[PDB]
Design a protein around this nucleic acid. Sequence first.
RNA 1: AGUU
Length: 852
Amino acid sequence: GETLGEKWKKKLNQLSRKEFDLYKKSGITEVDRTEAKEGLKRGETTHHAVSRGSAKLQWFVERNMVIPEGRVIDLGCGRGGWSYYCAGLKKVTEVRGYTKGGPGHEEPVPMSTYGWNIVKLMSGKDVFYLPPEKCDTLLCDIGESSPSPTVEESRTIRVLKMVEPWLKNNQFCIKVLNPYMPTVIEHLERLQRKHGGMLVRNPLSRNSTHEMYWISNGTGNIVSSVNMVSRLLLNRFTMTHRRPTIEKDVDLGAGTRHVNAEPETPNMDVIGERIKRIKEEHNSTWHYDDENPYKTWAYHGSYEVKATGSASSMINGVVKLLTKPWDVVPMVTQMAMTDTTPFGQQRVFKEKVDTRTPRPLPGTRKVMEITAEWLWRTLGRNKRPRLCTREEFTKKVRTNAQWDSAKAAVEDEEFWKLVDRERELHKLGKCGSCVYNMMRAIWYMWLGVRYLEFEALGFLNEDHWFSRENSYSGVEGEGLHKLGYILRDISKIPGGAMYADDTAGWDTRITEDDLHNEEKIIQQMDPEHRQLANAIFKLTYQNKVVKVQRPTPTGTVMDIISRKDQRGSGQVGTYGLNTFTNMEAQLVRQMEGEGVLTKADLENPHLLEKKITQWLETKGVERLKRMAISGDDCVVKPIDDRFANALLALNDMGKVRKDIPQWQPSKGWHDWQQVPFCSHHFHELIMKDGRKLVVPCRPQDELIGRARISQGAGWSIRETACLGKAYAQMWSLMYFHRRDLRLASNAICSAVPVHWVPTSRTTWSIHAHHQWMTTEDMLTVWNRVWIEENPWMEDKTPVTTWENVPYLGKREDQWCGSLIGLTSRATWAQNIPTAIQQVRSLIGNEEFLDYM
RNA sequence: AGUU
Ligand SMILES: *O=P([O])([O])OP([O])(=O)O[C][C]1O[C](N2[C]=[N+]([C])C3=C2N=C([N])[N]C3=O)[C]([O])[C]1[O]
Ligand SMILES: Nc1ncnc2c1ncn2[C@@H]1O[C@H](CSCC[C@H](N)C(=O)O)[C@@H](O)[C@H]1O
Ligand SMILES: [Mg+2]
Ligand SMILES: [Mg+2]
Ligand SMILES: [Zn+2]
Ligand SMILES: [Zn+2]
């Protein structure tokens, strides 16, 4: 008789328009298309997925249900979501899209996303009038819905009969609009006997459609899976309404794809021993997956592993309810949906890490060489490089700036025996166990590899090589409270505007030549030190072996991959080396801006050195003082504004700017208070004394958003509060000028016990000196930071009350996201005594004293 | 189904 899909249909068509509206998305997975749909309106052709379809297809490609390869044919491509996504897949060489177009139908949208040069979409091409072509991958998403099941039925069969002749021992993913009608089930079964595969439900599909997808890589009972969907959809009628799960939309990159230029060539004599050891520490589940996704990293093998990560983050209770208005604001409640699930990370690797930078021109390479040799010499004018020791490393661990096996390990004499063993390999130019991650005690191998880095390259951070005194451009050991002052001093330097261009994924943009230039520091080292440093550079920085997780349809596996260039982001002195190359890169760009370095010079194979040496030796230091370089973050105030147009060398060096077309001139500021740097801008405040403060500031919502997050007590109240009181005291020392934050700060500290220890990292930022931890009176701590220890505060007159500590002007406070003025803020302002009384009751009966 |  009647099928469960048909019962579902009849009941779907009986819902009210508002009962259907809720059912349509109850418990489904959706994609955030807001950013993409406004990029499309602004006519942007990069990064954006052209429709919801790219994310839909991704779900299948993720689980290898279909693995597009060779020539891909996309029947009914529409705007081209599936076609644009396939263009960036490893084994894909060509994509052809056929769609009907015309009135009432989707026309393909031209894009410049990565691999556009192998995509060919055509309108005026009805596939039901089209002779089948040879292809290695057949996609089809055609399915015109209907409130009549039997109408949907014949439409589905029409699609099926159309599409069958395209199938011939090739990959395929085909939408089956209505799969529960008996005759379709019948036809699918005959199809499954001939071409194999299986029907699968996509979680991104709305509950208002029964659509399933016939994919080639799978086997299973058709009737069973269809009826499972039927029950699920039928269940979601009566289940209490669930707000859909929201994913982050796909990033399809930009630029042409040269498939032959992607594959990595591994130095097996360098990385072989490391692989071998991984292989036999996990020999029981070790295998080689030919279906690995890596385009530009060299794959070596895999072993099985239990899954790690979450799609969302644990919210802090104490703050969440002391900040009731922000329960509703989107920007705050969104930084929880960061996803570190195997899927989430494999997505990140594809779009951000699995890329390859073209080798810079010979002229560009010479410039970087000359500049680096000079820069290194400048950085070592007073200091010598030095080795760091076990004693030094151990002390740094015990001052744990919970990684707690860290303090156990260094005390283990057995741990250091392994370290010694590995060091003797490095002296012979070999590496056995230096592998890092992206996320039986293999833990020792990893704390040991970090130490050896620290031993050889730790001096850069510990001896403050990139402090402002030593590097002019640098800002190491300064802190948020000092950064804004440095920007204000820079603005006093005559010239062009202040430019702050962010590189897109800096660490992935580090090149072979960058690595070879940072390496030059070893020339200043003692022999025994150079030996160890040369081992670090050559064997582990220029030959990286990485463990990375990957979800598969039969479990999670750990992939072992390798890469010669790029930067290992989890390495010692990543900050310093980033700062160095960025300093060099910005000097290079200043030369081009000043006309010293021309297009002819970058292309010219033998660039005469005399010109660049002269510029550096006469102007270099002055130009370094025009900059503030913190790792990959820079602020540059050149001698004029030609710099904004100086783009040849910067792009050729691989340091492509973020969120701007590759050849569009940079836009800078002349108001230094609007310059972004280290995730902040900096306001100048006038105390009613008359003296001036330069405070750090940022969008208030991302300050509040971070503080509604634990790290990570599940579920400990007498520890989740101590994280909140840490934020609350940071807000007091650093963001006192914000009205909501300072008020919220007084609402937290009065709600949390007086001498309860504040722990856990607030932010692990290099410029966060964390001097807000002591359970000391905040005004006295504030006074030491902003008055007596402040070099830019001449009059050391102390502050006796919190009303001599200024705010931002209401206008400027509001512009930075403050909710003052909104009456919900007012109701919140007079309800925080209760909210305070709430958590104090939620904690218990202990030492409170009021900051109300 | 995609588009709002
Ligand atoms: O397949 P979609 O997710 O994209 O959903 P839709 O809107 O095209 O139509 C699918 C089925 O859902 C039913 N439908 C459509 N509308 C606008 C309504 C309904 N059902 C009810 N009770 N009220 C509606 O307004 C149709 O059966 C349609 O085939
Ligand atoms: N007979 C036909 N021949 C070619 N294309 C057709 C067709 N009938 C419908 N189509 C197109 O097929 C599309 C199905 S929706 C496909 C969207 C696509 N998967 C994406 O990710 O963007 C519709 O846009 C429709 O215009
Ligand atoms: Mg910046
Ligand atoms: Mg629809
Ligand atoms: Zn090693
Ligand atoms: Zn601000």
